[model samples]
Target chain A: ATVRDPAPQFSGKAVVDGAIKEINSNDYKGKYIVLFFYPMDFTFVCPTEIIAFSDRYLEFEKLNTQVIAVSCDSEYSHLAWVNTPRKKGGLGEMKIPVLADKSMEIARDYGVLIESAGIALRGLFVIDKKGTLRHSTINDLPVGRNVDEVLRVVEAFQYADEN
Target chain B: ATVRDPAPQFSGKAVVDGAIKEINSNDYKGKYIVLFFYPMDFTFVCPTEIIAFSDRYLEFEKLNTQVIAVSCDSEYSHLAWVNTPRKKGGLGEMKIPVLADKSMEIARDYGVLIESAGIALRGLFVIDKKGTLRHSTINDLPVGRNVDEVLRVVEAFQYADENAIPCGW
Candidate 1:
């Protein structure tokens, strides 16, 4: 419930096509970040958001921003989903690496992980070019989120940064 | 797209259950407000949120707060929803009023109305007791929101207000 500046540093393992990649927030320094959490992979309404952001991944890059999608799903689940073709209800060929918050320390630190539910909500935090959380949103399942608005929000923060 | 606060005035006639009522923000002075917008009435996700807030009505009043649920649905639609019993497909009732944004001006002011789509998003604004908007969250259709989290945010703002240096935070 507390708003944290400098958005906490998260060290975890991310899944990229069945390979576990060591992940850290420090590596993406000097760039804006879009850190979002969904309940799970291959579930209802989650893929729509993950793929939507992925479709526009280059736009985020143009703003010097990185999109890191998080879910409690294990790295293996993430890899399987990514490798699954779009024709078969999978997120075909993802550019963004989905991180595993199986321990959920990252979600708890960000206040998105729900203990009673054993999953994270549709939570998102927009960390600015300086690692400050300027905006956040959390939604329940059975609902799809708007990627354009988050894009606009990132633009808003970057605009503040530039001007 | 500007991301700048619209500074929308609290001026309008919000029809509550077929009766026209003016929404003068000044009346709510010294009370925190949870002004939330929904797409329509009799929908799957909309009532779940409206009723959730209604169930937790006392919580808002305890915070010295008021809640206003807005929708583009006509006053007739709102009245119909209210009239329907809880057993049926209606909102049943609530501690707050469901404002009919028939004109859509208020929705535009809050930047929640999709002019082209003709429906509002799940836009929620937490206005401080002093009338300044402290928080705004807008979600697309199909997504229901969390009212408890809104209360937590309201508590945070109230805590900030109680301190001598609110700006210091």
Candidate 2:
């Protein structure tokens, strides 16, 4: 739940690589991952962040990482948002998967769930290849985050691990 | 025993500021600490490292940190080393306390003890104000360490804890 500790494991229905599929934490063994929590889809501030990461997704892959975007919304809505037009507040053809935490279990496990709002905050976690969470950030609401800053921390940890 | 986890509790006899006294981990509940381990006193590489941190004691104090040096040596030898005269392989009047782990319990608790040699490696640990062990380095032998690197990691963790730096330029 915190840095230097094991991140809570998650496996669920998700839309990945432009297809309906499953994403499991166990499957990402020996690789880093970016697990980010955004508010439900089809809203403001979400699409741009998603698309920017999608646009720069290859950089994460070069570092042996995968980006898994999540919302407490349904997988159906997640897929729908991928098909929705980017000009109309939609997430178009995402390079990363959109995880549907409809039950909100994933959100709760990551400590970003707002029980009253029935949604999650903007929680960003960088879990290393060993499945230990090495860095984290949480904004109260939908504030756009710096993907470059995220990569910086990722690279810092990677360098520390190797050197 | 690892980073982001609680450091093992320790309270023992040690030499501090020319006095034989007790140093307890519980006593330093709200401040930072550096728990450094060495092979033993009156040896090469140990005194230099000890004196360097002791010489830079005020910097750690400014950061609200107490440096505790530990070795499997006895309290008598620890106190003797303080008076042993730095010119003769002794640590002279150290600014920081030198913990005497006569039983080797403290080193074992920190996971730095070498059972075969009945001594410890060069293990340096930086514990934050929250009592969490944040940064650690353990070299197999008597390898010297960069004190600035330790300070850098210490400062880095402290900053991160307090939102010390702006997210990005």
Candidate 3:
């Protein structure tokens, strides 16, 4: 939640390619991490952003970056949503891992959980290899993210780190 | 942290079968939950207790209960430890989910986090289907838990719930 501050360390289960796996802060050591959060799984507007990121997962990976998405749904729910056919309102497989922030603690750490609504807003964070949260952007529920802009920022950060 | 009080909700990523997945509190709605905390990962005594519960996971499931473990280690650490062959002092594989409480908020909410040490004590909790903490226990770092005793308590609670009986642990 505190920007420019070291990104809060976290560990939890995430669904990747239809399997539940543990994800943690240290796994991305020496790599850029894009930790993004949405309100919930199996909903509208969220998938567009998730799939867009998925579509561009290779780009992020090429830049030594990892893109992780989170929502208030359980891992089972995330798995179900991913297995759901895209034509039938599912993610239709994604390369990026989607975090299940069912406890909402990570959202609270990221200062995006809407306690009143029992969900999180659209929160995107860019963390450098040093664990410093370099950039963050939050949006209302109805809005989606710009994958290109996210890439651009990562590029900028990589450039800065190299120099 | 308060016993008999409402167990604070939590959600986080976990590692199972050398993969990471999300785990959360609300996922166990209408079911009893046994949420336990350990001091840290990659330690001497932690994995013994964790593996014990995991070995008895089916028993817990048969009793309509869920088992969850937590510690301050990152999920990656948990996974690495799990993937490490047990002979080399690793958990190998576990049926239950382990939480990465790196933020320490879940440990704080459960009243187990030692703020000065930046890690949680050996704390175990049992919550009823309604989400209230029913039983609580704390132990030192060198001590380990009795998984059978934990199951016994869960059985007693389930029995008491069925009949009009009240009991204490």
Candidate 4:
């Protein structure tokens, strides 16, 4: 019976490039944000989505939205994937900071933490400039998330907010 | 690198008159089928879709298709929900069998199962008479599935089958 959208608050932190950084909800004030969560660091379908979002980084920036990808893996694991080359089947260099949800707290707060498997699902959230979650989408694992569709959804939400 | 309609498939069983029957790719052969997974029963978003499709079930039959609603709950649970009157916050009566996917295996097979929660998201799959999956789409758990969208995708596949030389995949 609870109203889900424009959720009460955002509770999470960033473990970016082997460094742990606290990400407060207030820090994202007055700017749109595309916050997404994936299951693990290296997997079959996960990277396809991470890389696809990397391919479309500029589009998100154009919308004045910051993109942050989250997972339950440690910062070192994220760095390993980022440093490894694409030809060798690594993420190489990603434009966005992949946040570490190692504590699994953020994943749980977002309602996607797989408590048993100790992993997260493909949960994507679109927070508007006003700091309300205007849109959200979660996909089942084993299938790649589509960046084009995410972009379209972001556009749709922004359009609705504007009009 | 298996390329399907970019949708998920999961194992499910439809129970009719207290008898459980498996509903997988094998069962769908030689019959055009409409198989969809909704988030939960007795919820606001799900019933709108169930009722909309139920109202249009005859149209689906006219097109030579069978409709099945699959959820993560059990058959007894589905029956109980259906037995409740709509005015008192239940599904009332639905003609199609609401299959139970309690094990979450079928949802996983269809690629629509959430690994964390062990529940199926809103996924719609259209399998042809040949048992080959023709069309599929999975909406997020919160958003409701569209019946018109389902019909359109079905027609697109049906149209391609009637006109295209290769038929379908």
Error of 2 at B155 (Å): 1.3
Candidate 2 deviant stretches above 4 angstroms: A1-163, B44-46, B164-169
Expressed as tens digits, the lDDT of each residue in A44-98 for candidate 1 is: 3336668888888899898899899888888888888888776566787877868
Clashes of each: 0, 0, 18, 9
TM-score of chain A of each: 0.91, 0.96, 0.96, 0.86
Alpha-carbon error at A134 in model 2, in Å?
24
Please report how far candidate 4 places residue B153 from its true position, in Å.
Answer: 12
Give each prediction's DockQ, rounded to 2 decimals: 0.04, 0.04, 0.03, 0.04
CAPRI-style docking class of model 3 based on DockQ: incorrect
Order of models, best lDDT first: 3, 2, 1, 4
- Which lDDT tens digits does candidate 3 get at residues A1-163? 5778999987788888878899887999978999888775545333687898998899999999999988755565576567667885678887999886656678878899876555788989999999999999999988878999999999998898879
Give model 1's DockQ, 2 decimals.
0.04
Ranked by lDDT, the better of candidates 1 and 3 is: 3
Q: Model 4, range A1-163, lDDT digits (tens) per residue?
A: 0112464455455655445566666676776788788887756333666878877899988877778888898877887877767765678778776787778887877767778889986667777777766555554454445676667666766776676
lDDT of each: 0.73, 0.78, 0.81, 0.67
CA displacement after TM-score superposition, residue B22 of candidate 1 (Å) = 12
* Worst 10 contiguous positions by lDDT, candidate 2 chain A: A136-145
Weakest 10 consecutive residues of candidate 2 chain B by summed lDDT: B160-169
Sorted by DockQ, highest first, which candidate order results?
A: 2, 1, 4, 3
Candidate closer to the true structure by DockQ (higher is better), 2 or 4: 2
Clashing pairs in 2: none
lDDT tens digits, residue span B111-153, model 2: 7787878997777787877787665555434244556666666
